[PDB]
């Protein structure tokens, strides 16, 4: 049906690859199987090599490199890709260890990005960018500061963009009258070789004056619309500079991204809750 072909200026060497978004099932990473198409004159003695990379930039800290030689040799999709090509069609087969940093980049390249590089030379160029990605498989926080503040989330797993609902319970016995309630979202993006980032904040001047109870639900939504101008914002894997989502929530060595909900009063005791922000499997 659909398969991606890449070539260099001379085009003697072509790489056919089925997918370009590798799903980490957390036990078996979708194996990387591709086909190299060459000619005899352009190679003759020089063998055909291909490489998988996990290049981390910001510094080029490739946490892993493996070499598989298309020619000489050392799967059905490979079968069908080969049958159309003939003698100079040679498979390469890389297997990603399950424990690699997923594909995350930083909006100004930087971050984590896999890659398949295909070349031909005598002794161990086509640049095919791939990525690692994951699919989406009841938070409750308390604080007795008086000012009893309880927050709860309907569910922990929310897809990118879907609104998140927060139940707030404010019991105020005190004489200290509230000014605001802010339900904010914090995106922690730790660069490992953990910075707070405000992405959404539904502030309402809901004041619960002495000896009172406040019980209502807020709905907050972190979106890239207002986050376009946030330096260090962890975006998801960018293929050839497409437009990407927010760096999803890692499910555990590169950049570690987590997401929490913070319910802050301005009196100002608060709470914090985590949630998952990964796309669902289509």
């Amino acid at each position, epitope marked *: 049906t659909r398969v991606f072909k890449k070539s260099s200026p001379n085009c003697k060497l072509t790489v056919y690859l089925g997918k370009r978004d590798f799903v980490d099932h957390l036990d078996k990473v979708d194996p990387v199987d591709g086909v190299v198409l060459v000619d005899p004159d352009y190679l003759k003695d020089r063998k055909v090599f291909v490489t998988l990379t996990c290049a981390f930039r910001y510094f080029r800290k490739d946490l892993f490199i493996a070499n598989y030689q298309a020619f000489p040799p050392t799967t059905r999709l490979q079968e069908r890709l080969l049958r159309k090509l003939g003698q100079h069609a040679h498979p390469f087969f890389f297997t990603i260890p399950q424990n690699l940093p997923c594909s995350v980049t930083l909006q100004p390249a930087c971050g984590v990005d896999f890659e398949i590089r295909a070349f031909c030379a005598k002794s161990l160029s086509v640049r095919l960018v791939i990525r690692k990605v994951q699919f989406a498989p009841q938070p409750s926080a308390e604080t007795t500061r008086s000012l009893h503040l309880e927050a709860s989330l309907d569910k922990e797993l929310y897809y*990118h*963009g879907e609104p998140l609902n927060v139940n707030v319970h404010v019991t105020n016995n005190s004489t200290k009258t509230v000014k605001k309630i802010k339900v904010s979202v914090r995106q922690y993006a730790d660069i490992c070789l953990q910075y707070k980032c405000p992405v959404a904040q539904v502030e309402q001047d809901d004041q619960v004056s002495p000896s009172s109870t406040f019980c209502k639900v807020y709905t907050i*939504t972190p*979106l*890239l619309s207002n986050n376009r101008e946030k330096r260090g914002l962890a975006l998801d894997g960018k293929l050839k500079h497409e437009d*990407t*989502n927010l760096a999803s929530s890692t499910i555990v060595l590169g950049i570690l991204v987590s997401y929490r909900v913070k319910v802050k009063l301005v009196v100002d005791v608060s709470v914090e809750l985590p949630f998952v922000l990964m796309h669902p499997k289509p």
Partner: antibody
Amino acid sequence: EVQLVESGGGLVQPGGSLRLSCAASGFNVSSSYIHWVRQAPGKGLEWVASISSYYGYTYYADSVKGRFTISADTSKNTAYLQMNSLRAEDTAVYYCARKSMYHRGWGWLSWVYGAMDYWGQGTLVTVSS
Amino acid sequence: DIQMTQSPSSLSASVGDRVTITCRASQSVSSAVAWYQQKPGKAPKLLIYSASSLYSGVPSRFSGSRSGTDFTLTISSLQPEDFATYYCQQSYYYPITFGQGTKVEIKR
């Protein structure tokens, strides 16, 4: 099930204004390209505007750039098209449609602007002095 | 913008006809086209995407194909119920441009 409801259709003098609300059920405005289309009386369709909240992109047809303005409310999961300076030619039956940005294989596709497969039911927008 | 012209502006047809409807774009298109079948009074329905796909629920008797920039919509058996206008529209560039209908008439 995914559906849209277009509301806010009634008479309005030329040079006046109206507001159309597209209530989207079954999906989010941040995970779908929302397109406001219309159809003149006894003619074919015409694409008016289209938005995507997640990336905050807006695109108007050259005839409704500025005279119409589209946005959305994610809390209510709704799309809003404020129609300014409605004119006689603007008379039509207006539709709302949605393109799921899913099924790239993993996540969103930011460069498809795909075909709008789920239309509403059509609300008449009149203009008459 | 792109003038997604469609021809014929009107074609005669009856039961069993294999109608061919052509849509030619002013500028290059990249398999991004959809042909919408509107009955008089109702709202359109998706028929073609990717210039060759079949949206779920679209009757198999409809088909679309690409022979370059000229997108072909073929209704092998134009059944009695499929009497409506057919407009082609490319979803590649913006602002989207619609065709000018292929009024599916009846012959007597």
